[PDB]
Enzyme design. Sequence first.
Site, PDB file in Angstrom:
ATOM      1  N   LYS D 154       0.859  -1.141  -0.045  1.00 31.74           N
ATOM      2  CA  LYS D 154      -0.037   0.031  -0.017  1.00 31.74           C
ATOM      3  C   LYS D 154       0.761   1.123  -0.046  1.00 31.74           C
ATOM      4  O   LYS D 154       0.241   2.516   0.138  1.00 31.74           O
ATOM      5  CB  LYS D 154      -0.791  -0.091   1.288  1.00 31.74           C
ATOM      6  CG  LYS D 154      -1.566  -1.147   1.704  1.00 31.74           C
ATOM      7  CD  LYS D 154      -2.034  -1.035   2.992  1.00 31.74           C
ATOM      8  CE  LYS D 154      -1.129  -0.789   4.086  1.00 31.74           C
ATOM      9  NZ  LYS D 154      -0.163  -1.893   4.023  1.00 31.74           N
ATOM     10  N   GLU D 180       2.404   5.961  10.898  1.00 30.04           N
ATOM     11  CA  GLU D 180       3.418   4.943  10.397  1.00 30.04           C
ATOM     12  C   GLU D 180       4.724   5.519  10.470  1.00 30.04           C
ATOM     13  O   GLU D 180       5.145   6.416  11.182  1.00 30.04           O
ATOM     14  CB  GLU D 180       3.084   5.047   8.917  1.00 30.04           C
ATOM     15  CG  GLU D 180       3.378   3.293   8.344  1.00 30.04           C
ATOM     16  CD  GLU D 180       2.324   2.350   8.981  1.00 30.04           C
ATOM     17  OE1 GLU D 180       1.414   2.881   9.354  1.00 30.04           O
ATOM     18  OE2 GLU D 180       2.694   1.134   9.070  1.00 30.04           O
ATOM     19  N   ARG D 181       5.796   4.549  10.387  1.00 30.85           N
ATOM     20  CA  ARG D 181       6.946   4.747  11.004  1.00 30.85           C
ATOM     21  C   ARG D 181       7.800   5.676  10.526  1.00 30.85           C
ATOM     22  O   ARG D 181       7.577   6.186   9.278  1.00 30.85           O
ATOM     23  CB  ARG D 181       7.539   3.039  10.727  1.00 30.85           C
ATOM     24  CG  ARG D 181       7.812   2.771   9.172  1.00 30.85           C
ATOM     25  CD  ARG D 181       8.517   1.402   9.188  1.00 30.85           C
ATOM     26  NE  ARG D 181       7.346   0.254   9.354  1.00 30.85           N
ATOM     27  CZ  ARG D 181       7.435  -0.573   7.957  1.00 30.85           C
ATOM     28  NH1 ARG D 181       8.318  -0.440   7.157  1.00 30.85           N
ATOM     29  NH2 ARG D 181       6.348  -1.438   7.901  1.00 30.85           N
TER      30      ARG D 181
HETATM   31  N1  LIG Z   1       5.540  -3.137  -6.922  1.00 24.82           N
HETATM   32  C1  LIG Z   1       6.161  -4.151  -6.358  1.00 24.82           C
HETATM   33  N2  LIG Z   1       7.318  -5.063  -6.845  1.00 24.82           N
HETATM   34  C2  LIG Z   1       7.983  -5.794  -5.909  1.00 24.82           C
HETATM   35  N3  LIG Z   1       7.702  -5.864  -4.827  1.00 24.82           N
HETATM   36  C3  LIG Z   1       6.943  -4.982  -3.711  1.00 24.82           C
HETATM   37  C4  LIG Z   1       6.054  -4.116  -4.853  1.00 24.82           C
HETATM   38  N4  LIG Z   1       5.271  -3.592  -3.921  1.00 24.82           N
HETATM   39  C5  LIG Z   1       5.494  -3.981  -2.613  1.00 24.82           C
HETATM   40  N5  LIG Z   1       6.536  -5.098  -2.799  1.00 24.82           N
HETATM   41  C6  LIG Z   1       7.034  -5.778  -1.635  1.00 24.82           C
HETATM   42  O1  LIG Z   1       6.119  -5.773  -0.493  1.00 24.82           O
HETATM   43  C7  LIG Z   1       6.513  -5.083   0.506  1.00 24.82           C
HETATM   44  C8  LIG Z   1       5.197  -3.912   0.996  1.00 24.82           C
HETATM   45  O2  LIG Z   1       5.689  -3.165   1.913  1.00 24.82           O
HETATM   46  P1  LIG Z   1       5.398  -1.638   2.138  1.00 24.82           P
HETATM   47  O3  LIG Z   1       4.475  -1.282   0.789  1.00 24.82           O
HETATM   48  O4  LIG Z   1       6.534  -0.839   2.229  1.00 24.82           O
HETATM   49  O5  LIG Z   1       4.316  -1.384   3.373  1.00 24.82           O
HETATM   50  P2  LIG Z   1       2.932  -2.057   3.681  1.00 24.82           P
HETATM   51  O6  LIG Z   1       3.351  -3.082   4.493  1.00 24.82           O
HETATM   52  O7  LIG Z   1       2.014  -0.905   3.915  1.00 24.82           O
HETATM   53  O8  LIG Z   1       2.710  -2.634   2.412  1.00 24.82           O
HETATM   54  C9  LIG Z   1       7.783  -4.511   0.103  1.00 24.82           C
HETATM   55  O9  LIG Z   1       8.906  -4.156   1.219  1.00 24.82           O
HETATM   56  C10 LIG Z   1       8.270  -4.965  -1.070  1.00 24.82           C
HETATM   57  O10 LIG Z   1       9.161  -5.927  -0.737  1.00 24.82           O
HETATM   58 MG   LIG Z   2       3.390   0.663   4.845  1.00 24.91          MG
END
Ligand SMILES: Nc1ncnc2c1ncn2[C@@H]1O[C@H](COP(=O)(O)OP(=O)(O)O)[C@@H](O)[C@H]1O
Ligand SMILES: [Mg+2]
Lengths: 70, 49, 502, 466
Positions: D154, D180-181
């Site tokens: 997200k 959030e962090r």
């Molecule tokens: N478009 C993408 N391509 C590859 N990996 C992704 C993608 N979107 C998210 N991820 C993986 O999923 C995780 C999502 O965590 P993040 O988006 O930072 O916060 P949340 O836990 O709110 O989703 C990321 O650390 C990444 O490893």
């Molecule tokens: Mg997040």
Amino acid sequence: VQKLFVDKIREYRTKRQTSGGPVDAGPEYQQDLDRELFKLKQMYGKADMNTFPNFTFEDPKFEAVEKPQS
Amino acid sequence: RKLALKAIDWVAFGEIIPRNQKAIANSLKSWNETLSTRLAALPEKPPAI
Amino acid sequence: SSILEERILGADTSVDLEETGRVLSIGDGIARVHGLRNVQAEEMVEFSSGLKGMSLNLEPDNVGVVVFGNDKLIKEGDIVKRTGAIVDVPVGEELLGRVVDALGNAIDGKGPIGSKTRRRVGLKAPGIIPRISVREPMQTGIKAVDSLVPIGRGQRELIIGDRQTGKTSIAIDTIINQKRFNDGTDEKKKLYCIYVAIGQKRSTVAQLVKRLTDADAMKYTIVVSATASDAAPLQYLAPYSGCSMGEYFRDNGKHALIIYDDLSKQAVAYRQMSLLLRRPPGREAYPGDVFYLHSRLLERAAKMNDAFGGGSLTALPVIETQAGDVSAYIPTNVISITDGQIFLETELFYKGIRPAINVGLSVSRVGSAAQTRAMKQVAGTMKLELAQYREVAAFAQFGSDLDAATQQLLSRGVRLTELLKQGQYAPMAIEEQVAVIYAGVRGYLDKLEPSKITKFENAFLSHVISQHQALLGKIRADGKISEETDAKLKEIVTNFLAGFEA
Amino acid sequence: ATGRIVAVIGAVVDVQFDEGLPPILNALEVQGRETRLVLEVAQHLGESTVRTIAMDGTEGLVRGQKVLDSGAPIKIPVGPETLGRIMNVIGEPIDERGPIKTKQFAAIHAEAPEFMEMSVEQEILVTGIKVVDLLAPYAKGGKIGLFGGAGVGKTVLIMELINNVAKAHGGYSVFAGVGERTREGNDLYHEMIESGVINLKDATSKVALVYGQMNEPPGARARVALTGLTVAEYFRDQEGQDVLLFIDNIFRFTQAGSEVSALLGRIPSAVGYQPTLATDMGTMQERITTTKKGSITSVQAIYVPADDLTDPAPATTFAHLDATTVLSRAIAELGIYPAVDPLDSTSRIMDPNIVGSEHYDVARGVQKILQDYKSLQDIIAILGMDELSEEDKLTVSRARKIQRFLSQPFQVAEVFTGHLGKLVPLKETIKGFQQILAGEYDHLPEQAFYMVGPIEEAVAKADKLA
Ligand SMILES: Nc1ncnc2c1ncn2[C@@H]1O[C@H](COP(=O)(O)OP(=O)(O)O)[C@@H](O)[C@H]1O
Ligand SMILES: [Mg+2]
Ligand SMILES: Nc1ncnc2c1ncn2[C@@H]1O[C@H](COP(=O)(O)OP(=O)(O)OP(=O)(O)O)[C@@H](O)[C@H]1O
Ligand SMILES: [Mg+2]
């Protein structure tokens, strides 16, 4: 409170002495009525005061069909 | 209301039979359907001023 | 300007002794008031700043009061006054074509509504003597509704389903489709409509008045609006106020219609409003009488006898359910108040059946079967030919071949399934429905392809309104499809099928 | 206008006045502390006694400690000098670059717009993501939600709609961080200074920032979201711009409102939430609007608790949106990133007259082939692929080429996997799905439609493996 009835009419008549729009506009009413006058024209369109419709249309060209027959 | 009528000409009008010219009539009735009701809403008069 | 000065000379400054109760607390909407001796229950009390409220609990020490508005202008030590009236809203035909809030003040800005008579929001449903059975039809213009799940006039029908499946659009094609009767001549085929918006943001209700004003639908409806920003006692009062403008029509002769969009948001405004009054929670923290909340509402939708006026009041409550589960607490309490239902699904919407009506499950106590005479002929056989289809048409894996035996019947369904699909904000008529349904059941479409029937429909429909206007006027006037009227239609479908695809 | 502390329970300080009771949601100033401690009146408990909620920590308070009345709610300095500055819940500069000097101040609490100040005009904001352009198109002036669990994406998705929309924007921008962090709120400062959006040396900066993170007391997380919401209204009503607004995360407005609702003396509703769950949300969300004076294009990230969409905190946000992008966990176990659920995501502008009647038929026609793959998963899992017909081995093989052709490499994700971020235009996705629905690519394998940009890379990836 008819003593208040006279006192809001008599300071309404003072507002009926007006010269140029607002009495205490300053930079407030001049900016707001100009910000709003753009927005009734910004996403609406660019239109002058009295210019009529000026354009011209062309219809579909009537091609023929070639046909050796019988 | 300047508007013209016609005859019932849908059955064999695609059967014109040119030299394999099936697209000549199959495009011809296709223009004929859309142009009919659309020019009817043009033909009579403009609305009130 | 002359308008401000004439508003100030008409103002009446009347003064009298009030009856007055000092405030002891104010938090989250509840104002425990010391004093207020002779107050009634459900009386409307009026705070000092211009706010308004309704005293629910009576108690020996304090008096519980909930606020119609905002609780930040109210400080401990204020003054609560007495109006002297159980809570009432204005009523009439003068509200027609407006958007109003839950107490009858206009939020459209066309001015003050000139209304003359006031009617309570807590009145009583009529009993056993002054009703009659359901004689008339109510046409929606949907083709899966009018043929298969008909709805009489005076019958509570429940539109139930998930979010984003069609529950609002179904009840807005119904608002549009009565345009043709309202500019007609007889006063007994009209249908005046009412829409109640509970828990909806203002960027949906100001957008639905747009869709209802290009088609000129807004000249015969009212919109009672309690948005999600309102006080929780204003989302509770909204369907009891909207239903009480419906009973100006029904108790004077005419026919009304009312949509509650929706009634799962008139329940969480009762759960919150009556937890802060310190009332003990029931199941899912709902109060004891959520069944009594919905039942005393959905029984005013009557059909009076002809020695009172004969008017009717249909109702169409919408209910949103979670994950398509119908065995929840608030769904099952309102399934068993309504005569019939319309089960909207999601896998119908996405496979392609739109409006996504489960015609298998959409049962209806048929309302003394007031479908109409001609639709009974073509949709009587349609109902059975579709029911024959659904028992036998769910394999998706074929191994054997019985074209003389099975594959003829399932070819009649896909021609009648793809006929039942419709568009949006373009509802048909009933004789334009009899014509297109005639051509499906009489075998006149089994030589097409099913990917061309939606294209076949609009070319057919434009041909009959243009070239055959005196044909359809004998179905609408005479009611039935006569045997000589059966004769004339037999050529028109076959003459058009002779030159449809060329 | 003075009073003394009577009781202290966590972050709910009780305070008794003697004359001059403060009205509800004023501010009170606690005298005798090293920092600023501001108490905001919540209730009126009878006989000159209020109950307040505190914005900072309450440790070290004694009874009898004096408390002084401000006269007004929490006000923050608003204006064009707020751009490039970071603030907290009471509007003090936490960038250590000195004070914020504006001519005017804006209260945190204001009402909602009326009925007759709404704007209904809808358009399409083309982003550059295939899942959003085709199936669920965003608008230009409408609210957007990104529902998702914990660990789905997200905010990588919200770092794209900055990287694609806030670069080509002409007006201003506002970001808010609610609960959030804090290291992620540091890498947005050292990525907008490097890329010219923050200008430390003059007045050519575009974005504002507002921050209350997951270390605060829960009287601050419950009110930091009304702070960035106020700096993004001056840039709408009084300057007349077209502002963006990015909120992450808006669930913590509600999670940290059922932590101070137990101690105010309230019977709890269902699974543990406050009794007023869905009136305080409809008073925060009813101010984030496009109106006749400007246009706010909201993008809010929303959290679903323990991966449940029927929980009362996500499932009451749905009535406040226009678009919707429900993400999923089991999708992202396959590798489809952005893990968008194509069956659960909606819009209000997906319509044949708005999105164009050619696009609307590739839209509804690709949901039809996707549903029919779902409706046979009972039989394929038990029995096998090999007990199917020949027409329904051709909605299975065509709907596995379509799932893989919804995954796109993002620009912000180059540093993870080392693959170039691709932006596609709108007209090259409609053209590229009609050539999977008509059946032109039925010989290419399914490993070629995966993690590519425009459709010509799919035949190029198929050209590589031979
Ligand atoms: N478009 C993408 N391509 C590859 N990996 C992704 C993608 N979107 C998210 N991820 C993986 O999923 C995780 C999502 O965590 P993040 O988006 O930072 O916060 P949340 O836990 O709110 O989703 C990321 O650390 C990444 O490893
Ligand atoms: Mg997040
Ligand atoms: N007859 C129809 N055919 C195809 N699509 C339709 C039809 N009617 C409505 N839709 C589409 O379905 C979507 C949802 O419709 P609608 O908004 O009425 O659902 P809803 O369940 O009332 O939404 P909410 O859950 O917000 O109340 C809309 O995008 C609309 O454009
Ligand atoms: Mg709806």
